[PDB]
Ligand binder design. Sequence first.
Ligand SMILES: [Mg+2]
Ligand SMILES: [Mg+2]
Ligand SMILES: [Mg+2]
Ligand SMILES: [Mg+2]
Ligand SMILES: [Mg+2]
Ligand SMILES: [Mg+2]
Ligand SMILES: [Mg+2]
Ligand SMILES: [Mg+2]
Ligand SMILES: [Mg+2]
Ligand SMILES: [Mg+2]
Ligand SMILES: [Mg+2]
Ligand SMILES: [Mg+2]
Ligand SMILES: [Mg+2]
Ligand SMILES: [Mg+2]
Ligand SMILES: [Mg+2]
Ligand SMILES: [Mg+2]
Ligand SMILES: [Mg+2]
Ligand SMILES: [Mg+2]
Ligand SMILES: [Mg+2]
Ligand SMILES: [Mg+2]
Ligand SMILES: [Mg+2]
Ligand SMILES: [Mg+2]
Ligand SMILES: [Mg+2]
Ligand SMILES: [Mg+2]
Ligand SMILES: [Mg+2]
Ligand SMILES: [Mg+2]
Ligand SMILES: [Mg+2]
Ligand SMILES: [Mg+2]
Ligand SMILES: [Mg+2]
Ligand SMILES: [Mg+2]
Ligand SMILES: [Mg+2]
Ligand SMILES: [Mg+2]
Ligand SMILES: [Mg+2]
Ligand SMILES: [Mg+2]
Ligand SMILES: [Mg+2]
Ligand SMILES: [Mg+2]
Ligand SMILES: [Mg+2]
Ligand SMILES: [Mg+2]
Ligand SMILES: [Mg+2]
Ligand SMILES: [Mg+2]
Ligand SMILES: [Mg+2]
Ligand SMILES: [Mg+2]
Ligand SMILES: [Mg+2]
Ligand SMILES: [Mg+2]
Ligand SMILES: [Mg+2]
Ligand SMILES: [Mg+2]
Ligand SMILES: [Mg+2]
Ligand SMILES: [Mg+2]
Ligand SMILES: [Mg+2]
Ligand SMILES: [Mg+2]
Ligand SMILES: [Mg+2]
Ligand SMILES: [Mg+2]
Ligand SMILES: [Mg+2]
Ligand SMILES: [Mg+2]
Ligand SMILES: [Mg+2]
Ligand SMILES: [Mg+2]
Ligand SMILES: [Mg+2]
Ligand SMILES: [Mg+2]
Ligand SMILES: [Mg+2]
Ligand SMILES: [Mg+2]
Ligand SMILES: [Mg+2]
Ligand SMILES: [Mg+2]
Ligand SMILES: [Mg+2]
Ligand SMILES: [Mg+2]
Ligand SMILES: [Mg+2]
Ligand SMILES: [Mg+2]
Ligand SMILES: [Mg+2]
Ligand SMILES: [Mg+2]
Ligand SMILES: [Mg+2]
Ligand SMILES: [Mg+2]
Ligand SMILES: [Mg+2]
Ligand SMILES: [Mg+2]
Ligand SMILES: [Mg+2]
Ligand SMILES: [Mg+2]
Ligand SMILES: [Mg+2]
Ligand SMILES: [Mg+2]
Ligand SMILES: [Mg+2]
Ligand SMILES: [Mg+2]
Ligand SMILES: [Mg+2]
Ligand SMILES: [Mg+2]
Ligand SMILES: [Mg+2]
Ligand SMILES: [Mg+2]
Ligand SMILES: [Mg+2]
Ligand SMILES: [Mg+2]
Ligand SMILES: [Mg+2]
Ligand SMILES: [Mg+2]
Ligand SMILES: [Mg+2]
Ligand SMILES: [Mg+2]
Ligand SMILES: [Mg+2]
Ligand SMILES: [Mg+2]
Ligand SMILES: [Mg+2]
Ligand SMILES: [Mg+2]
Ligand SMILES: [Mg+2]
Ligand SMILES: [Mg+2]
Ligand SMILES: [Mg+2]
Ligand SMILES: [Mg+2]
Ligand SMILES: [Mg+2]
Ligand SMILES: [Mg+2]
Ligand SMILES: [Mg+2]
Ligand SMILES: [Mg+2]
Ligand SMILES: [Mg+2]
Ligand SMILES: [Mg+2]
Ligand SMILES: [Mg+2]
Ligand SMILES: [Mg+2]
Ligand SMILES: [Mg+2]
Ligand SMILES: [Mg+2]
Ligand SMILES: [Mg+2]
Ligand SMILES: [Mg+2]
Ligand SMILES: [Mg+2]
Ligand SMILES: [Mg+2]
Ligand SMILES: [Mg+2]
Ligand SMILES: [Mg+2]
Ligand SMILES: [Mg+2]
Ligand SMILES: [Mg+2]
Ligand SMILES: [Mg+2]
Ligand SMILES: [Mg+2]
Ligand SMILES: [Mg+2]
Ligand SMILES: [Mg+2]
Ligand SMILES: [Mg+2]
Ligand SMILES: [Mg+2]
Ligand SMILES: [Mg+2]
Ligand SMILES: [Mg+2]
Ligand SMILES: [Mg+2]
Ligand SMILES: [Mg+2]
Ligand SMILES: [Mg+2]
Ligand SMILES: [Mg+2]
Ligand SMILES: [Mg+2]
Ligand SMILES: [Mg+2]
Ligand SMILES: [Mg+2]
Ligand SMILES: [Mg+2]
Ligand SMILES: [Mg+2]
Ligand SMILES: [Mg+2]
Ligand SMILES: [Mg+2]
Ligand SMILES: [Mg+2]
Length: 249
Amino acid sequence: GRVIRNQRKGAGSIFTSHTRLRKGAAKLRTLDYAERHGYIRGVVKQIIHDPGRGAPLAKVAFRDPYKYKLREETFIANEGVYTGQFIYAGKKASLNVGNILPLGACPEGTIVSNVEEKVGDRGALGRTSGNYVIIIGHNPDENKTRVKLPSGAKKIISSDARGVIGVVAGGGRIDKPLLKAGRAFHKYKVKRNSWPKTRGVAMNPVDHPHGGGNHQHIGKASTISRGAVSGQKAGLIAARRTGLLRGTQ
RNA sequence: CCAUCGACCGAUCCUGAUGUGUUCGGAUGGAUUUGAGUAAGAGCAUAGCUGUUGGGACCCGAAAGAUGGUGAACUAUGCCUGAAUAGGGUGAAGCCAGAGGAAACUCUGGUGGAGGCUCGUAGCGGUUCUGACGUGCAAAUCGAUCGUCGAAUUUGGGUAUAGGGGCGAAAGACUAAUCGAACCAUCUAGUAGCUGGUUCCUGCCGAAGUUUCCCUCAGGAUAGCAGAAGCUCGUAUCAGUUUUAU
RNA sequence: UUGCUUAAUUGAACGUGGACAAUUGAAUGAAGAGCUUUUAGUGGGCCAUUUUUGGUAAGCAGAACUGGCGAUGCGGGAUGA
RNA sequence: AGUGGGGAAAGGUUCCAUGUCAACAGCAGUUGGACAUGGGUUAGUCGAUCCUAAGAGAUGGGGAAGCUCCGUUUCAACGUGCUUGAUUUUUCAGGCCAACCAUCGAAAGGGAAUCCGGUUAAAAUUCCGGAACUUGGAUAUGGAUUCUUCACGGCAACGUAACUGAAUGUGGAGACGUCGGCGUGAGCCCUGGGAGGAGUUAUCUUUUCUUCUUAACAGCUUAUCACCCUGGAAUUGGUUUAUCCGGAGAUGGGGUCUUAUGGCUGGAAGAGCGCGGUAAUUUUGCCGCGUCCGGUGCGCUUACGACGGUCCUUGAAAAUCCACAGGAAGGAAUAGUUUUCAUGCCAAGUCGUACUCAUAACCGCAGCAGGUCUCCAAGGUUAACAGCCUCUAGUUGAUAGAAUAAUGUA
RNA sequence: UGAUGGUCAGAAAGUGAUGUUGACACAAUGUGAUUUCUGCCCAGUGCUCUGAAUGUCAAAGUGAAGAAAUUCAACCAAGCGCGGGUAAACGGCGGGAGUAACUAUGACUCUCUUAAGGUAGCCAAAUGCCUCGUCAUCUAAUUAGUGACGCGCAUGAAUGGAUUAACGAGAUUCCCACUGUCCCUAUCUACUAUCUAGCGAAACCACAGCCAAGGGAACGGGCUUGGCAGAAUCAGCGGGGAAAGAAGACCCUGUUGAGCUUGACUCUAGUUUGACAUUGUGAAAAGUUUUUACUUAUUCAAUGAAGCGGAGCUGGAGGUCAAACUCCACGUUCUAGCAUUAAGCCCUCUGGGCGAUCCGGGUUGAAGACAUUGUCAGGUGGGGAGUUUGGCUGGGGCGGCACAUCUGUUAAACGAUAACGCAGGUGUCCUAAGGGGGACUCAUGGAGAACAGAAAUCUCCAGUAGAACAAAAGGGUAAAAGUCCCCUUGAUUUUGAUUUUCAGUGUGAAUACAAACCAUGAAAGUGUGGCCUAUCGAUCCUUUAGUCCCUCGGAAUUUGAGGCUAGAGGUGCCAGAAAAGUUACCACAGGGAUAACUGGCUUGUGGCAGUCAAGCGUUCAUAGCGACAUUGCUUUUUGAUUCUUCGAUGUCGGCUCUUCCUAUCAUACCGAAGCAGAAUUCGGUAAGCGUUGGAUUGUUCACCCACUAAUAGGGAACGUGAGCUGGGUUUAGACCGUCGUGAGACAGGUUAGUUUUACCCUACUGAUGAAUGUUAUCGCAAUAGUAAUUGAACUUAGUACGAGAGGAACCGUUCAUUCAGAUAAUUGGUUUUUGCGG
RNA sequence: GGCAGCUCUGCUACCA
Ligand SMILES: [Mg+2]
Ligand SMILES: [Mg+2]
Ligand SMILES: [Mg+2]
Ligand SMILES: [Mg+2]
Ligand SMILES: [Mg+2]
Ligand SMILES: [Mg+2]
Ligand SMILES: [Mg+2]
Ligand SMILES: [Mg+2]
Ligand SMILES: [Mg+2]
Ligand SMILES: [Mg+2]
Ligand SMILES: [Mg+2]
Ligand SMILES: [Mg+2]
Ligand SMILES: [Mg+2]
Ligand SMILES: [Mg+2]
Ligand SMILES: [Mg+2]
Ligand SMILES: [Mg+2]
Ligand SMILES: [Mg+2]
Ligand SMILES: [Mg+2]
Ligand SMILES: [Mg+2]
Ligand SMILES: [Mg+2]
Ligand SMILES: [Mg+2]
Ligand SMILES: [Mg+2]
Ligand SMILES: [Mg+2]
Ligand SMILES: [Mg+2]
Ligand SMILES: [Mg+2]
Ligand SMILES: [Mg+2]
Ligand SMILES: [Mg+2]
Ligand SMILES: [Mg+2]
Ligand SMILES: [Mg+2]
Ligand SMILES: [Mg+2]
Ligand SMILES: [Mg+2]
Ligand SMILES: [Mg+2]
Ligand SMILES: [Mg+2]
Ligand SMILES: [Mg+2]
Ligand SMILES: [Mg+2]
Ligand SMILES: [Mg+2]
Ligand SMILES: [Mg+2]
Ligand SMILES: [Mg+2]
Ligand SMILES: [Mg+2]
Ligand SMILES: [Mg+2]
Ligand SMILES: [Mg+2]
Ligand SMILES: [Mg+2]
Ligand SMILES: [Mg+2]
Ligand SMILES: [Mg+2]
Ligand SMILES: [Mg+2]
Ligand SMILES: [Mg+2]
Ligand SMILES: [Mg+2]
Ligand SMILES: [Mg+2]
Ligand SMILES: [Mg+2]
Ligand SMILES: [Mg+2]
Ligand SMILES: [Mg+2]
Ligand SMILES: [Mg+2]
Ligand SMILES: [Mg+2]
Ligand SMILES: [Mg+2]
Ligand SMILES: [Mg+2]
Ligand SMILES: [Mg+2]
Ligand SMILES: [Mg+2]
Ligand SMILES: [Mg+2]
Ligand SMILES: [Mg+2]
Ligand SMILES: [Mg+2]
Ligand SMILES: [Mg+2]
Ligand SMILES: [Mg+2]
Ligand SMILES: [Mg+2]
Ligand SMILES: [Mg+2]
Ligand SMILES: [Mg+2]
Ligand SMILES: [Mg+2]
Ligand SMILES: [Mg+2]
Ligand SMILES: [Mg+2]
Ligand SMILES: [Mg+2]
Ligand SMILES: [Mg+2]
Ligand SMILES: [Mg+2]
Ligand SMILES: [Mg+2]
Ligand SMILES: [Mg+2]
Ligand SMILES: [Mg+2]
Ligand SMILES: [Mg+2]
Ligand SMILES: [Mg+2]
Ligand SMILES: [Mg+2]
Ligand SMILES: [Mg+2]
Ligand SMILES: [Mg+2]
Ligand SMILES: [Mg+2]
Ligand SMILES: [Mg+2]
Ligand SMILES: [Mg+2]
Ligand SMILES: [Mg+2]
Ligand SMILES: [Mg+2]
Ligand SMILES: [Mg+2]
Ligand SMILES: [Mg+2]
Ligand SMILES: [Mg+2]
Ligand SMILES: [Mg+2]
Ligand SMILES: [Mg+2]
Ligand SMILES: [Mg+2]
Ligand SMILES: [Mg+2]
Ligand SMILES: [Mg+2]
Ligand SMILES: [Mg+2]
Ligand SMILES: [Mg+2]
Ligand SMILES: [Mg+2]
Ligand SMILES: [Mg+2]
Ligand SMILES: [Mg+2]
Ligand SMILES: [Mg+2]
Ligand SMILES: [Mg+2]
Ligand SMILES: [Mg+2]
Ligand SMILES: [Mg+2]
Ligand SMILES: [Mg+2]
Ligand SMILES: [Mg+2]
Ligand SMILES: [Mg+2]
Ligand SMILES: [Mg+2]
Ligand SMILES: [Mg+2]
Ligand SMILES: [Mg+2]
Ligand SMILES: [Mg+2]
Ligand SMILES: [Mg+2]
Ligand SMILES: [Mg+2]
Ligand SMILES: [Mg+2]
Ligand SMILES: [Mg+2]
Ligand SMILES: [Mg+2]
Ligand SMILES: [Mg+2]
Ligand SMILES: [Mg+2]
Ligand SMILES: [Mg+2]
Ligand SMILES: [Mg+2]
Ligand SMILES: [Mg+2]
Ligand SMILES: [Mg+2]
Ligand SMILES: [Mg+2]
Ligand SMILES: [Mg+2]
Ligand SMILES: [Mg+2]
Ligand SMILES: [Mg+2]
Ligand SMILES: [Mg+2]
Ligand SMILES: [Mg+2]
Ligand SMILES: [Mg+2]
Ligand SMILES: [Mg+2]
Ligand SMILES: [Mg+2]
Ligand SMILES: [Mg+2]
Ligand SMILES: [Mg+2]
Ligand SMILES: [Mg+2]
Ligand SMILES: [Mg+2]
Ligand SMILES: [Mg+2]
Ligand SMILES: [Mg+2]
């Protein structure tokens, strides 16, 4: 047969992300002396739309502690953050929406976003619109914090990892139907080349494991082993179960 | 030279003398066994015809396979930067005014100018005539008719993706008139039990389509049938026939 | 002659020596008999008489013997392997 | 929405003049994109050149037997650094920084600066005449400023001929989708008077057609929006085609600003245009007159403006230029400073530039009914940039003659 | 899938895409707006989940034996197995009988059985074979359409079920309007064609070009026999040249491919699991293993390597029970401002210290001897690679085995002899069912004997085998070859010869001896498996036995290995490859050795016609029929065959047009009747002449409606595609149902799908034309062609005939149908009269 | 043909 559409994406010729209009990478500040020992104050200059992103971004200006210079940061805007607001980041920052605090400095039940998986990676968890991270508890002896991720998973993170207080702005986006193929076209025009999708069952046997037949049908189980190889992993990969989800999981 | 019975040498089997590193030796006598042997050498070398095998292999002929390269001037898709798209119809929100109601609210007239809306040009496409043409104007065009015509629109240029690879709103489609695996050169005079051809004269002889074996059944080998060279001899004793006896 | 065989001096096989001469033991014929090497093409067949199997039959399919066509012209069957 | 006038790609001399007809132009040929000989493309301002885009790609490194692959500042000791006071001791003294930063990548993106009239057989935003502009450099005079050293005025918005300002920093411009109606301008269309020229005139027609124009650049003036001062608003008012605004200060009164756009003047009538009268084999003219004053709009095209709608779509970058913050350093009185005020001086290299752009200059074997990106766009009819007729411009090219059976094609 | 990640890329990499990303995300799939719903099944195949105990279980490692190679054993990862989950995973979703005060049905019951047995819905639907289902409606008539019905070959629920407004160059039916689509054609215009001047190709071409019949490769231009036959030609035309275009694309063959699939054969990138290495330093506990401590190897990340680690200054605290130890902090939080090139103090040294605490120069985190990487080892791996996927055959395929074989027959009295001929058999079975010896006689019948009878056991007689001998059939056998008894292993050893098949090769099987050693019998003798004819297997490799022999090549010993001779392990496609599919996307070499048309032979079958005459026909065989039988014809059916064509003869039907046949439907003339008339039936000469308009269907066929004198049947390459058309079939797109794991299949349904060339020769239709002294006019007529057809009305006549009911015909008259040949008065149509008007 | 459990199921192995 032929190389299937799954495998052509790794080469990344026409499958790279369309990034001309993007407004910068959304990251926290580099963890420095001020954030480790006290707090540093910045001011929100802009709240802007980032193409390909549901969450708006905030442009926050900080002073450089060591040279006469202004540093502009690109944060993910939490809902309620406004232009001209003062943003405080550090160990001694107060528990206000938009402030960046270490996870150990936040009491249980604190809603936090753009949380660091590892100390200083500048934000990994809960970055999309309407999403957040809940702080479950602390383990001060081991310097660890328990959090709940938007997927429902419980994670143990260093208490020195940082997060931004509040919920990511732009939530409720999925509640409205797109209603049109053109709307999805414009949605993916600034994301990547993944739309529209032809069904593999509608192809020929060269194109896909599902192609061929005198009727459109998969022919074999569409649940594929985790240990299958590239060109085989088309369908439900390592599916623990199938069918309509009934009851609680 | 022919037929036949013997003899000798080697192997195999049997017997087993004087003797002895007591386990070796193997005299002697045998055997419906066996060798491409001995039995007063015939070979070696050169050349010629014919036949054989490997080689391009009598000549021309695949569909394929491999190695290394060249193409995105067509086209497919993404990206970057530009450009293009008469005139109408319909009349969404929002807004103004009036009327009715206890309230919750309702009705009417305007205004407004929404929509992968609609009629319809340019444009883009290509339904039907199964029209023309069909050694064409044209290796896809011409005419009428038709789809769509403000967006998933059309399009220039730049740029990216390269052959078991790309790209595909998916037809095995498109990837320079080439695609169910492009093009170029080479391996390569690839192999072919298959098709075609195979060049002067006369003289003499002259077939087979049958046996057996074969993944054998359009092919081979084998035996037969045929030619050539002769050799040993010269009526020796043979015959697709009869008779007699059985 | 033998180591085979017989109760044997019997036999078996192969012999020495002697006799039977062209009517040397039927016909007819005999461009002579015997022997060897090597190699070609072929290995689709078909037809006629007679015998014969399957089939309703077939210019059908399958065997037997012979003769033909193939490979072959010539006279006849008008024409025709 | 051309058979008009230009261009991009592509071609490459096809351009122009002269000669010329063997071949080619599927008839012809005296003609030609054919053949032969010559001629022809003029730039500081138009492009390239420079910038960065998607991307391409050296170096330091790391793979790979290797051809080479990855990577693009990457695990790198990465400046052929600058700015000054200089020194004439051709030595220096230092003062700042070195995040990022090889390079290539657009004749449609960004971007310093030019227009009009004339001129050739063929070139022209390139030549000639005149009139400007930008950048780089040099540099003097005038003006400006200083004894209160680095100017004044205005309540203010802000004004001006000028009117210090290093390192470093902050901003702005470059720099940005699309649609809808509205408003203003420009060009075109329409039209009145007057001064000319042409046409019709049996009859009619104070008639029909036509000329009456004004570049870049310089000065003054000119605007929606926005802003300032005054004042204090319900009986709410102002206000758009579109309902938004006002105690976070409306209406009213008075001002400030951007100069898009228009007006006046200079450029500039001397030019061009339209007439009339004369010169002459005649290179080429010479003379006179006029070139003026209006109006109109759901008009067309286009530019701009203030608005409004739209998106799970929010619609490049960089070079480059400026301003501001900062206060380093240097500054006067018998004299000091500055080329962001005026005037004056010098220079601007290299390459492209002819012509076609298509029913004959490109690609389809060809002078092929195919294909190939874009700009300008008159009158009538009309909803209309449709169809139909016409003006300017351009073509009249496609073998032809004679007949008019059948069968065709339309 | 929470980043030490998922998905994907790369030969590798200090390498990449998603990713300027972070579950409202990225990646992978299925279904396909809305509405209403998405039932039951986890047995199968997948996927997934745990492993406390656990079958299998690689390399390394461990233990034992051995002189060692080596062997054996224990242990033993993942995987598999075991257990669970999962269908909006792949998928699946049953049969048989009885039953209700008529019948029908079966609410109900019984019975087999599954993982579950098709739920809600829907339907002769694009899915139903039968089938043109049945009913209704639509029409004059409907294989079409629509509405119902439903034991539905084979409907059915995100392999989505049922609906559905709007939309559609999608498929279909009906109605109005409209019309040359048609009845049924006519006329007009331009451009061709045509003729001329100029210019000027190509396809194609063995030679060529008139027919009929024959034979012939079974459809001739040539050959044979006939008809005939007279220069040179022009415009048309499409009968023929099995016309041209292309080494058939269907079919088969080839030890030719390729695309695709899978549980084919053989591998493989990747991935996973173990071991060793990288790999070091400690502690503890289990018997080397487990755990956790260190950091410097290694790995991850960030930064313009900016503030790390420890200690000390300052406050806030503990209640201080010595003496200040322990803990915390140690300059910034109403506001969209500002923060940059140190002030100040101290020592003098255009400079140093403090401001700005000291010390360690570890940039800072994470991770850590685990990852990672290298090398082996096991698993997984149609993602990919390579290859394979018998033969015969009345085409192939399916079936069968006629593939190694045995008996009888075919088989034609030696031997041999074929077919997918006929009736059958073999892949075994037997320590006796082998060998020897001895004794006996079998099947069956009759006559007798308690229970006892047709069949128990006993007795006699008869008994040529009518029994038995392992198994097919044939042969053979009587003091035996059969039955019973006794003893045995000759079913042994060595190696030759011979017979059959035959090449006089192998294999199988068998025969007669030689040399041994035995069994049995008194002995002669017999015995080298089965009474005879079938009952079976090479090279290479392995294994065993024998000889204990030969060799391991520098010389030895002992292991091990290799030789020699004989068996065994097996090839059944049986003289003996190691082997799954699909192609409707297809390719190549060929084949008329071979299928799908026509043609040819045949004529079973189809159709048609005779002979006989038992019966039918009130009686009566034969007016008209005619059983049981029997003889033919035809080639308008379908078979059978495979002769022609596979370097191609265009394969359905219709339209159009001509001709022919007769087995005559009508029309002319007649004979017969169970012929009164009328009608009808049977028959003769007869093909002169006609044989229709429509609904449904692609249809041939069919079936209705209707008219008619009648609505006969056929042929001409199943006439006729360079005549058309293209509805069907039968390329490639797509849907459904059933089948298949799948790619895919269906001779099932459905929808969309390029129809090319004549200008040559001939033939046909027309048109000229040399020369028969020239020219003109008028003629003759050989030969060829030929043409008319049918009905109605009136009259005869309400007559003949007839009980009546009914009810003709000839002569004649007027019209009409179909056809033919003209013509343009009239009427209509046509208009470039561009004539006139608008 | 090896293991192992309940006459036998499961796993593993395959040069005539
Ligand atoms: Mg989707
Ligand atoms: Mg899809
Ligand atoms: Mg498809
Ligand atoms: Mg596949
Ligand atoms: Mg699969
Ligand atoms: Mg499939
Ligand atoms: Mg489907
Ligand atoms: Mg000799
Ligand atoms: Mg070749
Ligand atoms: Mg090749
Ligand atoms: Mg190969
Ligand atoms: Mg291109
Ligand atoms: Mg419009
Ligand atoms: Mg067209
Ligand atoms: Mg056509
Ligand atoms: Mg034509
Ligand atoms: Mg149109
Ligand atoms: Mg492009
Ligand atoms: Mg297909
Ligand atoms: Mg192509
Ligand atoms: Mg050759
Ligand atoms: Mg062959
Ligand atoms: Mg001879
Ligand atoms: Mg074989
Ligand atoms: Mg042949
Ligand atoms: Mg030979
Ligand atoms: Mg031979
Ligand atoms: Mg043959
Ligand atoms: Mg021959
Ligand atoms: Mg002869
Ligand atoms: Mg003769
Ligand atoms: Mg004859
Ligand atoms: Mg010229
Ligand atoms: Mg010419
Ligand atoms: Mg000429
Ligand atoms: Mg020239
Ligand atoms: Mg310029
Ligand atoms: Mg330059
Ligand atoms: Mg870049
Ligand atoms: Mg390097
Ligand atoms: Mg550049
Ligand atoms: Mg440029
Ligand atoms: Mg731009
Ligand atoms: Mg530009
Ligand atoms: Mg000029
Ligand atoms: Mg010019
Ligand atoms: Mg000049
Ligand atoms: Mg002043
Ligand atoms: Mg200018
Ligand atoms: Mg002026
Ligand atoms: Mg425009
Ligand atoms: Mg100046
Ligand atoms: Mg020019
Ligand atoms: Mg053209
Ligand atoms: Mg070319
Ligand atoms: Mg225009
Ligand atoms: Mg027009
Ligand atoms: Mg022409
Ligand atoms: Mg003409
Ligand atoms: Mg699904
Ligand atoms: Mg639906
Ligand atoms: Mg299940
Ligand atoms: Mg299961
Ligand atoms: Mg092991
Ligand atoms: Mg295990
Ligand atoms: Mg049901
Ligand atoms: Mg049904
Ligand atoms: Mg149907
Ligand atoms: Mg109908
Ligand atoms: Mg019906
Ligand atoms: Mg129905
Ligand atoms: Mg079903
Ligand atoms: Mg379901
Ligand atoms: Mg279904
Ligand atoms: Mg509907
Ligand atoms: Mg429709
Ligand atoms: Mg559409
Ligand atoms: Mg003609
Ligand atoms: Mg014949
Ligand atoms: Mg003939
Ligand atoms: Mg012929
Ligand atoms: Mg003749
Ligand atoms: Mg013809
Ligand atoms: Mg013709
Ligand atoms: Mg062929
Ligand atoms: Mg073969
Ligand atoms: Mg193959
Ligand atoms: Mg292929
Ligand atoms: Mg650091
Ligand atoms: Mg390790
Ligand atoms: Mg695989
Ligand atoms: Mg494969
Ligand atoms: Mg076969
Ligand atoms: Mg079979
Ligand atoms: Mg046979
Ligand atoms: Mg065989
Ligand atoms: Mg015989
Ligand atoms: Mg056997
Ligand atoms: Mg016995
Ligand atoms: Mg016996
Ligand atoms: Mg006996
Ligand atoms: Mg023999
Ligand atoms: Mg045998
Ligand atoms: Mg014996
Ligand atoms: Mg030796
Ligand atoms: Mg040695
Ligand atoms: Mg054996
Ligand atoms: Mg074997
Ligand atoms: Mg065989
Ligand atoms: Mg054989
Ligand atoms: Mg098929
Ligand atoms: Mg044949
Ligand atoms: Mg017949
Ligand atoms: Mg018959
Ligand atoms: Mg009777
Ligand atoms: Mg045939
Ligand atoms: Mg053929
Ligand atoms: Mg033909
Ligand atoms: Mg042909
Ligand atoms: Mg007759
Ligand atoms: Mg008759
Ligand atoms: Mg006739
Ligand atoms: Mg019909
Ligand atoms: Mg026929
Ligand atoms: Mg026919
Ligand atoms: Mg024809
Ligand atoms: Mg045709
Ligand atoms: Mg069709
Ligand atoms: Mg099809
Ligand atoms: Mg299935
Ligand atoms: Mg179509
Ligand atoms: Mg009467
Ligand atoms: Mg007529
Ligand atoms: Mg007129």
